[PDB]
Amino acid sequence: NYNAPHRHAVIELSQSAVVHNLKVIKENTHAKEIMAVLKANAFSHGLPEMASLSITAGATRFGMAMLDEALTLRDLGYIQPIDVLGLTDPRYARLAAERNITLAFSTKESIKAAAEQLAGTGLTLKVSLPVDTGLNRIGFKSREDLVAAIQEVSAQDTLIFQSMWTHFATADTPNVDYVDFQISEWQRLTHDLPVEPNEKHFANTGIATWYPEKINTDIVRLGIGLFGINGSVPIMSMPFELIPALSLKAKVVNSKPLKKGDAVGYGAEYHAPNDGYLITIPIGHSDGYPFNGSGMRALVADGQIGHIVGGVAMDQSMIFVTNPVAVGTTVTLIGRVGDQSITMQDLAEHTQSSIVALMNDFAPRLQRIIVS
Amino acid sequence: NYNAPHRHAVIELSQSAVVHNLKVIKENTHAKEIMAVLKANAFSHGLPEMASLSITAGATRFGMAMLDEALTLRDLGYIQPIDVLGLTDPRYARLAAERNITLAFSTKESIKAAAEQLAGTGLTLKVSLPVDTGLNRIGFKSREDLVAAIQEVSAQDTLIFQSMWTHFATADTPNVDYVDFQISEWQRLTHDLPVEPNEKHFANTGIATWYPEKINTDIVRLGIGLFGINGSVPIMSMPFELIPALSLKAKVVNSKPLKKGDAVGYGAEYHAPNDGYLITIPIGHSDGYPFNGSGMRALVADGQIGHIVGGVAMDQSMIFVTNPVAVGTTVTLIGRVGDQSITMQDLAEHTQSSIVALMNDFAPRLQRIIVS
Numbered sequence: 001n002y003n004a005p006h007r008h009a010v011i012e013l014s015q016s017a018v019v020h021n022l023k024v025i026k027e028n029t030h031a032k033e034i035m036a037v038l039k040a041n042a043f044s045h046g047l048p049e050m051a052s053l054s055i056t057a058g059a060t061r062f063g064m065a066m067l068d069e070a071l072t073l074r075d076l077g078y079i080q081p082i083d084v085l086g087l088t089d090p091r092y093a094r095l096a097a098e099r100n101i102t103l104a105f106s107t108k109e110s111i112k113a114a115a116e117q118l119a120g121t122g123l124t125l126k127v128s129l130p131v132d133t134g135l136n137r138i139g140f141k142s143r144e145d146l147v148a149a150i151q152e153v154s155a156q157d158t159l160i161f162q163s164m165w166t167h168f169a170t171a172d173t174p175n176v177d178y179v180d181f182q183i184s185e186w187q188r189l190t191h192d193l194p195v196e197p198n199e200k201h202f203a204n205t206g207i208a209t210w211y212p213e214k215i216n217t218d219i220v221r222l223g224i225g226l227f228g229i230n231g232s233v234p235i236m237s238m239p240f241e242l243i244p245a246l247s248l249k250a251k252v253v254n255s256k257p258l259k260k261g262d263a264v265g266y267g268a269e270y271h272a273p274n275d276g277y278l279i280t281i282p283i284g285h286s287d288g289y290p291f292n293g294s295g296m297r298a299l300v301a302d303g304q305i306g307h308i309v310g311g312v313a314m315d316q317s318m319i320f321v322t323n324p325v326a327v328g329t330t331v332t333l334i335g336r337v338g339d340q341s342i343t344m345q346d347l348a349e350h351t352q353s354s355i356v357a358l359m360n361d362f363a364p365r366l367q368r369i370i371v372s
Numbered sequence: 373n374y375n376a377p378h379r380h381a382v383i384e385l386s387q388s389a390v391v392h393n394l395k396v397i398k399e400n401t402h403a404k405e406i407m408a409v410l411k412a413n414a415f416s417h418g419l420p421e422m423a424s425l426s427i428t429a430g431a432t433r434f435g436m437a438m439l440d441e442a443l444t445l446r447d448l449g450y451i452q453p454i455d456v457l458g459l460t461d462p463r464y465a466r467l468a469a470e471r472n473i474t475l476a477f478s479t480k481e482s483i484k485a486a487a488e489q490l491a492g493t494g495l496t497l498k499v500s501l502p503v504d505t506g507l508n509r510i511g512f513k514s515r516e517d518l519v520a521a522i523q524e525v526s527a528q529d530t531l532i533f534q535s536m537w538t539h540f541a542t543a544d545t546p547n548v549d550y551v552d553f554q555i556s557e558w559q560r561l562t563h564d565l566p567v568e569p570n571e572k573h574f575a576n577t578g579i580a581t582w583y584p585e586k587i588n589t590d591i592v593r594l595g596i597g598l599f600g601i602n603g604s605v606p607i608m609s610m611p612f613e614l615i616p617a618l619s620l621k622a623k624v625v626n627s628k629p630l631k632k633g634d635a636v637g638y639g640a641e642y643h644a645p646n647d648g649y650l651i652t653i654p655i656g657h658s659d660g661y662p663f664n665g666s667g668m669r670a671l672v673a674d675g676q677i678g679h680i681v682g683g684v685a686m687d688q689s690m691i692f693v694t695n696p697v698a699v700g701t702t703v704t705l706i707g708r709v710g711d712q713s714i715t716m717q718d719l720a721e722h723t724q725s726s727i728v729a730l731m732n733d734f735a736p737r738l739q740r741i742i743v744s
């Protein structure tokens with residue numbers, strides 16, 4: 001009840017793209033398992049669609065940010081392993097236990113708590129223990145703390161020691177040796193434990209792309225690369241091609257000539273610099289399109305190159321074109337028309353805005369469609 | 373299946389705020405009716421809650437951007453009039469006609485196509501005719517086109533001539549007199565009609581706040597002001613107080629000391645200036661908190677004023693504080709703690725981001741809760 005199927009504005013998600021992206025990243029790292037990280041409604045691309053595409057692409061498990069996102073997948077019909085990579089109130093451990101959802105914990109006392117929640121229910125909880133190696137967001141910060149926590153899960157019959165893992169801060173980036181640092185930090189914080197977990201995993205998109213040999217990549221936690229976006233800072237060249245999954249289109253709802261000097265948009269600050277035609281489409285910055293995307297190209301279906309002008313409004317954008325355009329004509333905001341294309345990267349460049357932030361702004365109000 | 377009820381991160385929506393806001397706006401303008409404009413999941417604030425707060429506050433009708441939003445309102449159990457202020461595919465006119473939803477049209481052939489959709493169904497559709505007086509988004513551009521359209525709905529017994537309206541581009545603003553321009557333009561395009569609509573309306577928050585006397589304000593199409601946000605450019609003083617409706621809180625999930633020179637966040641670019649404590653909360657930019665919100669104050673429940681450091685990640689944020697803080701402690705990102713307050717405006721100032729854009733960024737992943 002968020003999407004608007006009767007509004008001719010859509011996000012297109014290419015199946016063939018996602019398939020290629022996982023293949024090429026998996027190839028680069030000779031991974032055995034690909035974990036599709038579809039947190040935040042699949043990086044705002046649309047979870048039901050991306051989850052499906054991910055499995056089609058060959059992912060075999062999921063990573064989500066929180067329990068409720070994990071619940072949603074189960075409710076979607078998926079039976080594959082699901083890791084919650086954020087932290088969870090132990091009071092709600094029972095839900096994860098009942099739906100085979102693996103939960104991360106960063107504290108011995110929270111582990112204890114989650115186990116006591118399950119005491120006597122006949123339920124069992126898979127547990128993961130993130131180790132903080134330098135990101136400093138979550139995880140154990142000392143071998144001693146880690147070893148104690150492992151001790152606790154071994155003494156709790158309702159818990160399974162599913163995994164240990166850590167996350168990189170600069171695998172995205174020319175900063176090797178913060179990568180190497182986190183890796184020696186792992187060795188420090190993690191060397192011979194009193195017992196092993198079922199699995200360990202380390203790699204995000206960055207690791208898999210630019211540092212495949214630094215560390216074990218049998219299990220890859222693949223988020224952004226899936227969506228065909230190069231998020232590196234600065235933009236680093238890759239050992240392969242990503243093809244972006246999402247394109248953004250809508251059909252003209254209002255069409256009119258406007259005369260030189262006519263003001264457009266809130267503030268009345270854009271004035272047409274000559275006679276032409278103004279084209280109104282039904283997506284705005286409430287759909288996720290950059291609040292300051294005005295001045296962006298926009299590829300009309302007839303092969304014209306228009307430009308967003310006036311404000312980008314909440315629900316509507318206005319486009320200036322030289323030649324008449326009929327209502328119903330689709331306009332591509334992101335994607336390809338002929339030999340012209342507009343990318344998320346063009347968008348980032350134009351708005352002086354992070355591509356990671358832009359790829360993540362799309363609201364559920366836009367109707368999603370899977371293609372090729 | 374979007375909201376995260378088990379995650380301790382919420383949007384709180386102040387009943388007393390919305391009530392005061394509408395009251396104060398209604399009073400300044402002496403409106404007879406107030407139309408809550410709740411497009412875009414109610415400016416990203418949360419539709420089911422804002423609709424309910426809107427009615428409690430004294431709104432007696434709704435305005436939305438599109439048919440599907442109107443549909444959702446109906447499916448929330450609301451029976452009050454609903455005006456769709458965007459344009460709609462005539463093929464879907466029946467859905468509106470079945471649910472007592474008023475629909476805008478900017479064209480004679482669309483009015484005719486919609487009437488023909490209804491012929492023989494026994495249904496009746498309420499139609500509004502937006503007149504473009506200088507915003508140049510949608511609406512009729514000539515008296516000739518307007519009258520030909522008024523005649524068409526008159527000739528069609530499946531249609532009711534519900535309203536004519538127009539929207540201002542600069543009521544937000546000190547550019548009076550583009551205001552006056554639009555008003556003379558109204559006169560120009562609109563003088564002696566062959567038949568009058570049931571109603572006409574003109575005013576948005578801007579008109580109602582800064583230009584109440586310029587034109588009839590019996591019906592006010594109240595958007596931004598309802599949420600207690602002053603969106604004027606440049607920030608203009610008002611003849612009343614707005615009190616912002618939304619605050620943003622979340623409970624600490626991970627808490628640790630960190631030592632001088634420790635790096636935090638993606639890029640490892642923040643270094644702790646001294647020995648301190650790092651507080652991790654479960655909200656990130658995927659929830660709508662500004663992507664470059666790092667450096668913001670964050671008001672911990674114990675009275676401490678912390679700061680967001682490292683990245684604002686997708687789902688999490690890290691906060692540096694001088695003194696240790698227990699897991700489960702709430703942090704206020706937007707709102708008030710003791711004699712300290714952080715507002716949406718503080719956020720716009722700090723991020724150099726439009727406050728209209730920021731107020732519209734919140735994802736449905738955040739749990740909504742109504743307070744006072």
Ligand SMILES: *Cc1c(COP(=O)(O)O)cnc(C)c1O
Pocket residue numbers: 037039063085167203204205206221222223224225
């Ligand atoms: C978001 C996330 C991922 C995915 O990382 P990408 O850089 O998008 O490939 C993997 N592991 C954890 C713990 C995460 O939070």
Ligand SMILES: *Cc1c(COP(=O)(O)O)cnc(C)c1O
Pocket residue numbers: 409411457539575576577578593594595596597
């Ligand atoms: C958004 C909108 C409103 C509300 O405008 P505010 O400035 O937020 O009060 C009123 N009328 C129309 C046609 C709109 O699109």
Ligand SMILES: *Cc1c(COP(=O)(O)O)cnc(C)c1O
Pocket residue numbers: 632633634643644645646
């Ligand atoms: C000590 C100190 C630091 C340390 O940060 P580094 O980047 O590790 O040098 C930073 N800022 C201030 C004000 C300090 O006193």
